[PDB]
């Protein structure tokens, strides 16, 4: 139950929630500190290469 059906995971973040009437229905406000910690692995491709190096 605790290690297989359920699991503690990576690429997960949690904080206090607050309402924003200027956000869209489908968007979630992510604080910089959390965006700066959470990381997506993008593959270097001819489409991204240029942007990707700038972020690197």
């Amino acid at each position: 139950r605790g290690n297989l059906m359920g699991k503690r995971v990576d690429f997960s973040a949690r904080t206090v929630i607050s309402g924003d009437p200027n956000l869209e229905l489908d968007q979630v406000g992510v604080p910089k500190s959390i965006a700066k910690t959470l990381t997506y692995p993008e593959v270097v491709t001819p489409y991204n290469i240029d942007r990707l190096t700038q972020l690197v």
């Binding site: 993008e42 593959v43 491709t45 001819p46 489409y47 991204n48």
Partner: protein, 84 residues
Amino acid sequence: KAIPKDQRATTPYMTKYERARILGTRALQISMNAPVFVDLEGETDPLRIAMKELAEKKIPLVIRRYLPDGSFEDWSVEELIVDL
């Protein structure tokens, strides 16, 4: 055992799950530097590319729809209707 094309009985339409797994699969391949089957008219996101590939039914994938007994119906993303 494999059901022949002339004897297929599943939807002529594509499931929500089929479409979501095709776009995921093509996006993963397009992103893994796979050959793209359409003019990327300024396109740079592998999902948007995959969506465009599907739009022109130019995705070389085949859905193997399995039945509870094990028997299955092979349907092409070309033949599957995308009303959704």
